[PDB]
């Protein structure tokens, strides 16, 4: 989950 946020942005 965390990585998805960082990747997204
Ligand atoms: Hg990305
Ligand atoms: Hg990524
Ligand atoms: Hg990058």
Method: X-ray
Report the alpha-carbon distance of residue 1 to residue 8 in Å, rounded.
Answer: 11
Structure tokens of 8?
Answer: 């997204």
How many angstroms does the Cα of residue 2 sit away from the middle of ligand 2? 11
Cα of first residue to Cα of last residue in the chain, in angstroms, is 13
- Nearest ligand to residue 3 Cα: 2
Report the alpha-carbon distance of residue 3 to residue 9 in Å, rounded.
Answer: 10
């Amino acid at each position: 989950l965390a990585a998805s946020l960082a990747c997204a942005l």
